[PDB]
Amino acid sequence: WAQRSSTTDPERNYVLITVSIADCDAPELTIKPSYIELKAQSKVHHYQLHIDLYKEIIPEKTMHKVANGYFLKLYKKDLESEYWPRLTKEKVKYPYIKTDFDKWVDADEQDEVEA
Amino acid sequence: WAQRSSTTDPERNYVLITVSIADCDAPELTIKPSYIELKAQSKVHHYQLHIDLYKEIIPEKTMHKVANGYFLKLYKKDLESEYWPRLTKEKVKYPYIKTDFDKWVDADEQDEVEA
Amino acid sequence: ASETFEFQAEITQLMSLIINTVYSNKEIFLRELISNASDALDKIRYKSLSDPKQLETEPDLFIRITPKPEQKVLEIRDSGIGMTKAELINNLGTIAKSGTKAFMEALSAGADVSMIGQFGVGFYSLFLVADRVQVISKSNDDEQYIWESNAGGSFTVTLDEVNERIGRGTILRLFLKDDQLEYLEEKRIKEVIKRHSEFVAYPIQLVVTKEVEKEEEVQEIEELNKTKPLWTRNPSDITQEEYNAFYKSISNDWEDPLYVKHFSVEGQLEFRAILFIPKRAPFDLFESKKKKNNIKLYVRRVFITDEAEDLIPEWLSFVKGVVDSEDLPLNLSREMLQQNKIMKVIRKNIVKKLIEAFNEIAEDSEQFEKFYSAFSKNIKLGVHEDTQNRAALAKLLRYNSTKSVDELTSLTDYVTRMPEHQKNIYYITGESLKAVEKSPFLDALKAKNFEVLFLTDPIDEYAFTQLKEFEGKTLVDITKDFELEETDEEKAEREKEIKEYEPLTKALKEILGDQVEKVVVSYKLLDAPAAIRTGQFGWSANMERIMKAQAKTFEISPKSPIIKELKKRVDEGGAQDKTVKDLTKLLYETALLTSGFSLDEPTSFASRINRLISLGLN
Amino acid sequence: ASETFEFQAEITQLMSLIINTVYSNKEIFLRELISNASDALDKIRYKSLSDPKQLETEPDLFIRITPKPEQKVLEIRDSGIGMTKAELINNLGTIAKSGTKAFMEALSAGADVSMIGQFGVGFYSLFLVADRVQVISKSNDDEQYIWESNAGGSFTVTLDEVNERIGRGTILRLFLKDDQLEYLEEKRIKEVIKRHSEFVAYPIQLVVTKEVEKEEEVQEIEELNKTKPLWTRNPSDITQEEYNAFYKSISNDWEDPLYVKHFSVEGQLEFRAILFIPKRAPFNNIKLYVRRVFITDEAEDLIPEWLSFVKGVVDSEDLPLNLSREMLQQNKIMKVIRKNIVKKLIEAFNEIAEDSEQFEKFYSAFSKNIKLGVHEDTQNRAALAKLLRYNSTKSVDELTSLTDYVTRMPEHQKNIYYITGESLKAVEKSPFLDALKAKNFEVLFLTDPIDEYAFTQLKEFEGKTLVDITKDFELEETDEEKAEREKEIKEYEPLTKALKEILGDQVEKVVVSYKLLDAPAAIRTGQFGWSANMERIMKAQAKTFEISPKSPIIKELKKRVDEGGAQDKTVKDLTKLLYETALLTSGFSLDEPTSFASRINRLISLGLN
Ligand SMILES: Nc1ncnc2c1ncn2[C@@H]1O[C@H](COP(=O)(O)OP(=O)(O)OP(=O)(O)O)[C@@H](O)[C@H]1O
Ligand SMILES: Nc1ncnc2c1ncn2[C@@H]1O[C@H](COP(=O)(O)OP(=O)(O)OP(=O)(O)O)[C@@H](O)[C@H]1O
């Protein structure tokens, strides 16, 4: 029962999440108000994942899809212009949660439209 | 009957040569006064190589050995402080002869031992 | 009608890719091996939380370099976890399989990760300097297995029958490329490690056979010594003697750091930082841009790069420092982040944090002037080259004044010294301290019940430029000035009394022709004969003297005894002259140098001086 | 008892290595695909030497971008050789297997390699911006096979049953990561290619449907155009209008390049180079290409600071190696190319040198940068020396080098004399050194400060020393005053020490020498010591007192020596005054600039009152 690696990245109104495995099948959807869970196995290593959120997401307006070889997920927050210091609700010495600097920016969210 | 790739590199008194294949066996020694030849097969692709020199080497004081996964060879020239514009004796549009910039320097041969 | 296939990159090449893909910086093999060795001890160490019987096999956690030139071999001993048979096989197929899995799934209720290193290549980089490798590992999970390769497509595994046993861990034998013997050299290994892998969590042991025998004496050494990473420990848990002792080691310096700023930032960046204001300026230069790079950056304990202009703006140059993140900014294979958005952020902080640090040193009588005698420039420099911190930086400036001569003064003091009847800050600049001090240049501002600063450094004016609005207050002088009524008594006569010198006004404008714009006789002076105020919204005469060095309006004092003579002779001689030729221009030229001016036409003037010793004393 | 095993790196990871190993510069997918596509045409093209029936299938050799936003797809058409079933399978297992083998063994009796690109990874970099890929290739050796992957551990191969056939070559379908749609943008593709893959051997075709709807108008474009590599053709095969037209394109400039230096170097480096001296100076140049593809561009590795302005371009076939495509990484290479781009570029000035006016047009532009180069070099110091042009007391409204000055001086001289200061005329007809003018020698005029900042590093020019202000001696001269020198200077010896005292400690000795005639006094800075003007500058950016005896205002001193010596009452505002007067006269600073002015107006007090 292995564990996939993950990806924080707040912006203005949302948080998105990049998992990580090759050719995973049967993606286990779990859109808990304050939790996220997935038990997708890869084409064998069985991967499972659960995380307590830092804040209240919107299980209503969220899309989950698969890209290639990583699972992607995305959700809107419950605020206006605030910024999460983590994804979970705890002491983040979490080994497998690391930041996705590709999508990460913050501080300059809608604040990079010049040259 | 394939062809391995090669490596020029004059210094003060010598020229050295890096071939390129994995785990080659039975290295075919040929130390012709003005020529070099090798028919070593790799552990299958049979590789053979011949090259006309630019000048007269010394088939007397030369060592050939094998490193790993490339064949190395080395020989002293017939001069004092001169510098080859090529390894062969022709029009070098030779695809497989390329310069080994690792060992290559020239112009500053013994004149790069400096602070 | 499809047919799926399995990617199958092939090795011979893939290796030569990793190794030969250049990196004219091939010392990294060591760094990489050590890293890989820290990784190992870090592994067993943690494995002992719940079972410390695992530690029995070797009570020490260390790595030991052992140069053996005699057979041209570089051994790297480590007492970390070591691999079993299968742990060699599996974990030594490239990239995939890394001692990361081991930490991928840790999830622990403490979850400590002293150890980072993925990619799962770093090992192969040993071939950069090694022709053949010899891995001997022993894990208290299997026997002593020997894993040997020559960068080929193949590797061998055998049970070590004869060859000294080890308690637990791994030994690495490097057979160096027949020239790479640079790495059997003491100084070299010291150079490399004590610069790339300095701040590891583990003692960095190095054997160096050295004898004092009378014509061998081995010595397990370099536990040396304040290796230790002073950012991993709580600020409170450190005072002076510990911060400063660190400084000295990381900057080959002899004096104590005037100040120090430990701190961190968290959120999604997560990096810690120590930074020092040194006691003295180098003293080197600088803005050659050729030299600077003091703030060395480490990710997860390992040295990455060091730099200047990405983290630290030019003018903060001097700040020796060090940064570290766990949240590995990513790095193409181990020498820079590659994502300079990261860079920018760390910069913001290392500034914001570093500014308050001055603002702190600010709260002090003398230890500030000790700092201000050191970096007067670099602050002023920062004022010019910033914008946002301009104001933050503004308060930090200290000059002289006609109110306080032998005494430092900021600007937040000047604002409180001025009455409500004033709204503009007045300052002058020029050659020296005394080359302006008791100079009746602006004596009718001194006796005008206001206040003026003294800006001896040229750089000063090169900053003040970018500040024509300080706390609503305007910055002024040499240039041009006005005030209200002032005592509506000689306001009243101004027009009438200047009109007395109006038949003298244009007359003086003519014998000097075209250089001036207007020749005025203003009471912004008392007994000093004449003055040359460069027009407003125009570069200073002193400014000029410098902006020109490396590549106008004429004021007269009416009450000056030598000027009343002019009004008399206006009648006794106007448009032309005979004796008042060597004089009309002369004083103009005198008042020129008076207004911090160049030796413009420097030969004709001298000749007037000796030419006006001709009638008086002869 | 051993047991050998076979390395077996594993894919999932190895990929994510290549792609995700960062490179905050992810436009390269295009460059890489194109390169990989050039590689292809280059392959079939050569394959026609001995059999041009192979070309029949598609007579044209080109690549065509085709943005199809509607399904968020980026097509890259190429009419190159294309792959067979097996050529897809085999050649698309990482690193190993590359379209290099194809050139590894060519050995040909011509052996042309327009095409380079190894490593055998560049393809996978497409996933940087593509979620899924679609390769459709047709080689006149097999049918149309479709190779599809999603950066996984697997790939699929199917015979294309329905989907428009192609003559020969390959089409690449990119389905971009749901945000990478920046790459369906016209301007963006133009930006990228027309900067990374500009100088390819092949037409760089781009479809761009426009807008026609009132109740669409596609256009196969950017054959523009205005691509072509001016270093691939013989110098003779180019003149002005072709070199300059190039410059303009590679440097978004409006004026004509003053000069140009095409050339190559061969041996074991093998690189070509075009370089331009621009017409004007402005307020990163020598863009470097290997085998036609853009690598980096730089300054301080190839070109020393002071040659900055030189816009250029370099190219080697002998690929200096490069960790995956963005710098050589072996800065020993760097150093060499530098040497040449200097040696070659110097003679280019030495050429522009052979000219009356077109040199002064260049010298009004880069007076500085040359002088700068003098200071910051050493080896070329002398090479650079000859290139300096100043004024002189021999030629006022007229340029002069130094190789002319050497021929103007008699054998009786061995040292070159120069002065410096504020301006042209702020020294010109200035009796500062009139007793050198009338001493039958010659002095230059160095108005720029930088000048002296170079002359420093030249106290030996062609054996000749450089000297300014100063100390001097000569033999007899006409052993008549000579004869009285000691006797007549001794007349002013009770005046000599007297003057040394009211000025106290600043001077070293106060002499009354005839190396002057009627100009009152002078301040010659001692020999083997920096000039007063030198000082004025070496200090700007961070002593001996001579009197003229025959001067009418100095004979007064000898009289008043008796009528007042050690102290004074009226001769207080005077003793120092003239010392300070003769100070500025000796190209000197405003040292104590407020007390002097006050003496001037203070000595208008008795004369005219
Ligand atoms: N000294 C050692 N003791 C025990 N196991 C080791 C040791 N060194 C390496 N390994 C094993 O082999 C791999 C280490 O070599 P590798 O080339 O992967 O470097 P890495 O540290 O894993 O990643 P990288 O070095 O690329 O950051 C790990 O998977 C680990 O399991
Ligand atoms: N346009 C194309 N037509 C046909 N084959 C191609 C094309 N582009 C790529 N290939 C295939 O890709 C293989 C290697 O290309 P890849 O980009 O992976 O590495 P490379 O191009 O050899 O070197 P580099 O990694 O520097 O690009 C070739 O052997 C060839 O089969």
Side-chain angles (χ1 to χ4, degrees), chain D residues 502-516:
Chain D
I502 306 184
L503 321 173
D505 186 39
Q506 283 161 259
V507 200
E508 194 67 43
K509 50 185 185 292
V510 176
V511 282
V512 198
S513 188
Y514 293 98
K515 294 177 275 180
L516 188 47

PDB file of all heavy atoms in Angstrom, chain D residues 502-516:
ATOM      1  N   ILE D 502      56.645  81.578   4.688  1.00  0.00           N
ATOM      2  CA  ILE D 502      55.267  82.096   4.811  1.00  0.00           C
ATOM      3  C   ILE D 502      54.252  81.113   4.211  1.00  0.00           C
ATOM      4  O   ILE D 502      53.040  81.251   4.396  1.00  0.00           O
ATOM      5  CB  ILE D 502      55.105  83.530   4.204  1.00  0.00           C
ATOM      6  CG1 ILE D 502      56.141  84.492   4.803  1.00  0.00           C
ATOM      7  CG2 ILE D 502      53.685  84.072   4.431  1.00  0.00           C
ATOM      8  CD1 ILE D 502      56.012  85.950   4.356  1.00  0.00           C
ATOM      9  N   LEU D 503      54.769  80.112   3.505  1.00  0.00           N
ATOM     10  CA  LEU D 503      53.957  79.027   2.972  1.00  0.00           C
ATOM     11  C   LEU D 503      54.243  77.746   3.751  1.00  0.00           C
ATOM     12  O   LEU D 503      53.563  76.732   3.572  1.00  0.00           O
ATOM     13  CB  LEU D 503      54.239  78.835   1.482  1.00  0.00           C
ATOM     14  CG  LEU D 503      54.437  80.107   0.648  1.00  0.00           C
ATOM     15  CD1 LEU D 503      54.870  79.747  -0.762  1.00  0.00           C
ATOM     16  CD2 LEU D 503      53.189  80.989   0.622  1.00  0.00           C
ATOM     17  N   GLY D 504      55.259  77.813   4.610  1.00  0.00           N
ATOM     18  CA  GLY D 504      55.582  76.753   5.560  1.00  0.00           C
ATOM     19  C   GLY D 504      55.815  75.385   4.957  1.00  0.00           C
ATOM     20  O   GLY D 504      56.804  75.166   4.250  1.00  0.00           O
ATOM     21  N   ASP D 505      54.893  74.467   5.240  1.00  0.00           N
ATOM     22  CA  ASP D 505      55.020  73.072   4.822  1.00  0.00           C
ATOM     23  C   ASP D 505      53.938  72.639   3.827  1.00  0.00           C
ATOM     24  O   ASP D 505      52.847  72.207   4.212  1.00  0.00           O
ATOM     25  CB  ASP D 505      55.050  72.138   6.042  1.00  0.00           C
ATOM     26  CG  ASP D 505      55.337  70.688   5.671  1.00  0.00           C
ATOM     27  OD1 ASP D 505      56.179  70.441   4.779  1.00  0.00           O
ATOM     28  OD2 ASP D 505      54.724  69.787   6.281  1.00  0.00           O
ATOM     29  N   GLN D 506      54.266  72.782   2.546  1.00  0.00           N
ATOM     30  CA  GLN D 506      53.486  72.253   1.433  1.00  0.00           C
ATOM     31  C   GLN D 506      54.466  72.013   0.298  1.00  0.00           C
ATOM     32  O   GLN D 506      54.450  70.962  -0.342  1.00  0.00           O
ATOM     33  CB  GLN D 506      52.405  73.242   0.996  1.00  0.00           C
ATOM     34  CG  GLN D 506      51.188  73.287   1.901  1.00  0.00           C
ATOM     35  CD  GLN D 506      50.381  74.556   1.731  1.00  0.00           C
ATOM     36  OE1 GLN D 506      50.476  75.477   2.542  1.00  0.00           O
ATOM     37  NE2 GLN D 506      49.584  74.615   0.671  1.00  0.00           N
ATOM     38  N   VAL D 507      55.328  73.005   0.077  1.00  0.00           N
ATOM     39  CA  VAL D 507      56.407  72.951  -0.908  1.00  0.00           C
ATOM     40  C   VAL D 507      57.575  72.128  -0.352  1.00  0.00           C
ATOM     41  O   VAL D 507      57.595  71.792   0.837  1.00  0.00           O
ATOM     42  CB  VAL D 507      56.913  74.381  -1.264  1.00  0.00           C
ATOM     43  CG1 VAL D 507      57.655  74.389  -2.596  1.00  0.00           C
ATOM     44  CG2 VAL D 507      55.757  75.373  -1.307  1.00  0.00           C
ATOM     45  N   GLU D 508      58.534  71.798  -1.215  1.00  0.00           N
ATOM     46  CA  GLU D 508      59.770  71.143  -0.796  1.00  0.00           C
ATOM     47  C   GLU D 508      60.947  72.110  -0.915  1.00  0.00           C
ATOM     48  O   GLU D 508      61.826  72.150  -0.046  1.00  0.00           O
ATOM     49  CB  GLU D 508      60.025  69.884  -1.630  1.00  0.00           C
ATOM     50  CG  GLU D 508      61.092  68.946  -1.059  1.00  0.00           C
ATOM     51  CD  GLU D 508      60.679  68.301   0.259  1.00  0.00           C
ATOM     52  OE1 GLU D 508      59.513  67.859   0.370  1.00  0.00           O
ATOM     53  OE2 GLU D 508      61.522  68.242   1.183  1.00  0.00           O
ATOM     54  N   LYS D 509      60.950  72.881  -2.000  1.00  0.00           N
ATOM     55  CA  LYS D 509      61.982  73.878  -2.267  1.00  0.00           C
ATOM     56  C   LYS D 509      61.431  74.986  -3.160  1.00  0.00           C
ATOM     57  O   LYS D 509      60.655  74.729  -4.082  1.00  0.00           O
ATOM     58  CB  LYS D 509      63.234  73.236  -2.889  1.00  0.00           C
ATOM     59  CG  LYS D 509      62.968  72.327  -4.085  1.00  0.00           C
ATOM     60  CD  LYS D 509      64.242  71.645  -4.559  1.00  0.00           C
ATOM     61  CE  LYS D 509      64.003  70.839  -5.829  1.00  0.00           C
ATOM     62  NZ  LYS D 509      63.141  69.645  -5.596  1.00  0.00           N
ATOM     63  N   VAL D 510      61.836  76.217  -2.873  1.00  0.00           N
ATOM     64  CA  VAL D 510      61.362  77.379  -3.613  1.00  0.00           C
ATOM     65  C   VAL D 510      62.500  77.946  -4.474  1.00  0.00           C
ATOM     66  O   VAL D 510      63.368  78.674  -3.980  1.00  0.00           O
ATOM     67  CB  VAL D 510      60.750  78.435  -2.652  1.00  0.00           C
ATOM     68  CG1 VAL D 510      60.338  79.686  -3.398  1.00  0.00           C
ATOM     69  CG2 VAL D 510      59.549  77.846  -1.917  1.00  0.00           C
ATOM     70  N   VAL D 511      62.489  77.585  -5.757  1.00  0.00           N
ATOM     71  CA  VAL D 511      63.550  77.969  -6.698  1.00  0.00           C
ATOM     72  C   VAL D 511      63.126  79.075  -7.671  1.00  0.00           C
ATOM     73  O   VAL D 511      61.944  79.222  -7.980  1.00  0.00           O
ATOM     74  CB  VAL D 511      64.095  76.751  -7.496  1.00  0.00           C
ATOM     75  CG1 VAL D 511      65.048  75.933  -6.640  1.00  0.00           C
ATOM     76  CG2 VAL D 511      62.958  75.886  -8.031  1.00  0.00           C
ATOM     77  N   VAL D 512      64.106  79.845  -8.143  1.00  0.00           N
ATOM     78  CA  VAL D 512      63.876  80.946  -9.086  1.00  0.00           C
ATOM     79  C   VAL D 512      64.622  80.647 -10.398  1.00  0.00           C
ATOM     80  O   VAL D 512      65.692  81.207 -10.659  1.00  0.00           O
ATOM     81  CB  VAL D 512      64.336  82.321  -8.495  1.00  0.00           C
ATOM     82  CG1 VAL D 512      63.711  83.480  -9.257  1.00  0.00           C
ATOM     83  CG2 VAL D 512      63.996  82.432  -7.008  1.00  0.00           C
ATOM     84  N   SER D 513      64.049  79.760 -11.215  1.00  0.00           N
ATOM     85  CA  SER D 513      64.709  79.257 -12.433  1.00  0.00           C
ATOM     86  C   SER D 513      64.264  79.965 -13.719  1.00  0.00           C
ATOM     87  O   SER D 513      63.110  80.390 -13.841  1.00  0.00           O
ATOM     88  CB  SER D 513      64.514  77.739 -12.563  1.00  0.00           C
ATOM     89  OG  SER D 513      65.293  77.201 -13.621  1.00  0.00           O
ATOM     90  N   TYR D 514      65.189  80.067 -14.676  1.00  0.00           N
ATOM     91  CA  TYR D 514      64.955  80.773 -15.943  1.00  0.00           C
ATOM     92  C   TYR D 514      64.225  79.934 -17.000  1.00  0.00           C
ATOM     93  O   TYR D 514      64.138  80.330 -18.167  1.00  0.00           O
ATOM     94  CB  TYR D 514      66.271  81.328 -16.509  1.00  0.00           C
ATOM     95  CG  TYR D 514      66.887  82.431 -15.673  1.00  0.00           C
ATOM     96  CD1 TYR D 514      67.914  82.156 -14.770  1.00  0.00           C
ATOM     97  CD2 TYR D 514      66.442  83.750 -15.785  1.00  0.00           C
ATOM     98  CE1 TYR D 514      68.482  83.163 -13.998  1.00  0.00           C
ATOM     99  CE2 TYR D 514      67.005  84.763 -15.019  1.00  0.00           C
ATOM    100  CZ  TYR D 514      68.022  84.461 -14.127  1.00  0.00           C
ATOM    101  OH  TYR D 514      68.578  85.456 -13.367  1.00  0.00           O
ATOM    102  N   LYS D 515      63.700  78.782 -16.584  1.00  0.00           N
ATOM    103  CA  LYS D 515      62.844  77.961 -17.440  1.00  0.00           C
ATOM    104  C   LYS D 515      61.457  78.609 -17.561  1.00  0.00           C
ATOM    105  O   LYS D 515      60.435  77.926 -17.653  1.00  0.00           O
ATOM    106  CB  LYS D 515      62.759  76.531 -16.894  1.00  0.00           C
ATOM    107  CG  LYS D 515      64.086  75.770 -16.941  1.00  0.00           C
ATOM    108  CD  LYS D 515      63.984  74.379 -16.321  1.00  0.00           C
ATOM    109  CE  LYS D 515      64.173  74.414 -14.810  1.00  0.00           C
ATOM    110  NZ  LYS D 515      64.075  73.061 -14.199  1.00  0.00           N
ATOM    111  N   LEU D 516      61.462  79.944 -17.559  1.00  0.00           N
ATOM    112  CA  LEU D 516      60.277  80.801 -17.652  1.00  0.00           C
ATOM    113  C   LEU D 516      60.775  82.221 -17.954  1.00  0.00           C
ATOM    114  O   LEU D 516      61.941  82.529 -17.692  1.00  0.00           O
ATOM    115  CB  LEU D 516      59.492  80.767 -16.334  1.00  0.00           C
ATOM    116  CG  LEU D 516      58.110  81.423 -16.206  1.00  0.00           C
ATOM    117  CD1 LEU D 516      57.182  81.066 -17.367  1.00  0.00           C
ATOM    118  CD2 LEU D 516      57.487  81.033 -14.874  1.00  0.00           C
TER     119      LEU D 516
END
